[PDB]
Symmetry: D2
Subunit: 250 residues, 4 copies
């Protein structure tokens, strides 16, 4: 029981990485609310992990600012005060900066940046000063460290999350809020997105990309998140945790 007593919100927790985070959190004794845009998918994902005594689904788009309040209230009414927020929801656009439409730019940033801001801001307000050993875990990427010529807007969003989380981490530390803020940086992981992009896994598995020569699995990200959520990581804040098969080491 490494997350005994923890109560977590995992955005985009109905598929891939987010689903695995939710799975392993529940396994380690946390109570979890997962969010998603699709109710049928979301309800099924929750039940695949456990009963309503340990996990619940809430239909929510991370860019829905007002919905964030409903998300915290619903999670609190179900499991008690929230202790853990994982801002994992996000979308992918494959365009160069040159080729990015303004509509694409705005759409992606509204989820990947504004959504994380909404979750972090409200997270700090609701969890500070309550002695919860609170932890906000913001999902960046290797794309928050290095550029990719075909991921301009994605790059922008992940670099923004990377540094904005440090700001939040320092404010919470300096004010003795008992809230930690950290970023996780996955490399290429086998997810529904990757499976659906023809040729993606093949390009990602090249040694010039991922030195291990294969892409990761959603559990690879889940376990580092269990670490950051647990009181094991009580001295870790404002830091970057990279799980990428060596992508950024070369």
């Amino acid at each position: 029981d490494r997350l005994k007593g923890k109560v977590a919100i995992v955005t985009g927790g109905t598929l891939g990485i987010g689903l695995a985070i939710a799975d392993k959190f529940v396994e380690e004794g946390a109570k979890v609310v997962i969010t998603g845009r699709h109710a049928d998918v979301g309800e099924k994902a929750a039940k695949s992990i456990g009963g309503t005594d340990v996990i619940r689904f809430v239909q929510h788009d991370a860019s829905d600012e007002a919905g964030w309040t409903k998300l915290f209230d619903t999670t609190e009414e179900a499991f008690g005060p929230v202790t853990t927020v994982v801002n994992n929801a996000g979308i992918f656009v494959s365009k160069s900066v040159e080729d990015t439409t303004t509509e694409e730019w705005r759409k992606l940033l509204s989820v990947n940046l504004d959504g994380v801001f909404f979750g972090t801001r409200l997270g700090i307000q609701r969890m500070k000063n309550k002695g919860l050993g609170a932890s906000i875990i913001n999902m960046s990427s290797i794309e928050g460290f290095v550029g990719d010529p075909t991921l301009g807007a994605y790059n922008a969003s992940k670099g923004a999350v990377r540094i904005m989380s440090k700001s939040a981490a320092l404010d919470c530390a300096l004010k003795d809020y008992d809230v930690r803020v950290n970023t996780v940086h996955p490399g290429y992981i086998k997810t529904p997105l990757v499976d659906d992009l023809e040729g993606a896994e093949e390009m990602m598995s090249q040694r010039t990309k991922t030195p291990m020569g294969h892409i990761g699995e959603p559990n690879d990200i889940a376990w580092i998140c269990v670490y950051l959520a647990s009181d094991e990581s009580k001295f870790a804040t404002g830091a970057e945790f990279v799980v990428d098969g060596g992508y950024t080491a070369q």
Copy 2:
């Protein structure tokens, strides 16, 4: 004449750092168009540097997407094809993430992030494949490297610029566009903003902040920009240039 033949757009070039960039560019033989929101201020700034044969003002807000096209066309009609873009325009908000209003968040990001995207995207389209030795210089900050508890949105914007510029730099390199993209990261510089924030220069000059014990001057940033604009830096792309009196070294 280190910028002989260069033609530069400098956004927010009517005050502080941007004004100094424009000054030293003209000094080194470049033709310059500076932009600003205020016509009286802008016209006066241009004339303070030189005549219309070497520098001109164009009234423009960097978040005005359509205006970017007018900005390139006007600069080209005046001086010939643009070779250099310095995305320097930006605003400052002093709020923690916790305390940032959504209106403040959006306003700041629209200039500091969208504006830089607009300039970079159009810059690549207009300067690629023309053999101009083109250079796009995006103004980040030390705030693109480290957090500040009271600069949440600013942090987000500067981290976004930092990584998005790498994406643009790689795309241009891989496609042999003859366009380089780099970021400059000023520490604390004596600017109209700093002069106007009561107590700011004092806090900034603490040895725990800036190891040199004083803040910089706008020319400190101008000279690194002359370097990046010139063909001297033809092998430099996707890199970060920090001029900060030691702020990030500790």
Copy 3:
């Protein structure tokens, strides 16, 4: 429930402070451990303080002793089976500016903090590759592997060397399918016996301009990220840097 079932770890400088907590929690998680140290009385007592001889043993060794590393691996293998995990934690401190550093101080620090980490990494790769052990080499760097300190010149040099050299080793092992991962851990200020001996040290480290949390860490703070890195939980993490510093490097 043991997170380190079947692992066999060598922890250098494991008789005190951070090294001791690493060994403690490693044994707690089902690993067998050999700790090293320069002083036998302290070391043997340290081993017994954690558990029985069936799970933890002491070996007297200076990390700069190249020949001794072979004995360390052989002795550990003979007691517990093939080594799966190496933690290069041993190191010394010198408080001098670059300007004020004697060459004797420079060489002595580097021989332990750099050469010793090299010896352990190199031999670790040779001895653990291709055995399917889920092998993990954990090199102790520091916040001083990221940022300078005006009064820690040689220390900075050693910690930055470890930071990047580990990436080289991580890449070679990955590219060769060696089943060895290499990562660095970067502690901030931790309450250790060294810190306890320096009067006022903890107070200075706890200033918000230094450590934003306003207090320094504890050895267990480093132990738990090392358990993560040692476990198969982290099978996709290699060549990366793990910082646990109370916010020191975030500002």
Copy 4:
């Protein structure tokens, strides 16, 4: 118009490649320069190839020769006046994995690439502080000070050590108002005589998976960022890293 008026620079390993171009452009910008190298015939010829004895001179010196550094400063001061600029560019290459690195190779590389940079930095601070010279110490790191290379273990270690040790020295000088700045330059792949001797080297380095621009740089590419760092133009830049690598580290 000279950007380096009044400067007096020592450039180690300045008889070939990157070091030579640094010295060349330094003299072009009004500095007086002493270049060092291990071989006198090449070195004296290298000095004359740039300019007259009133602006550039050769001194035979191995950067790992600690005692020789004092002679280097004294000889340079006697010819041109107080030294204002030091470029620690000298270094050697070993192509071995960490696993395959002999300790002799490890020690030899580190003695030049690390110890030599230390000797120059330490003495540079002692000799140039408080003289109001606009002093600048420029330490040559590399892309290998940022990222690992599986076949460059010792090189990685040395270049990461230089990267962080320079920050320590930069901080101490800043905090003490020494009027000395310390910075690191990080070349990517550059067309140098070493590269020319390795058949196929340039071709491999020019692959887009390595250098995104699809070609490698030239020594002048490094010379011009060094001119910037040497000049009073960069009076607010210290403890920072300047990367000129054709995009190598951006991906």
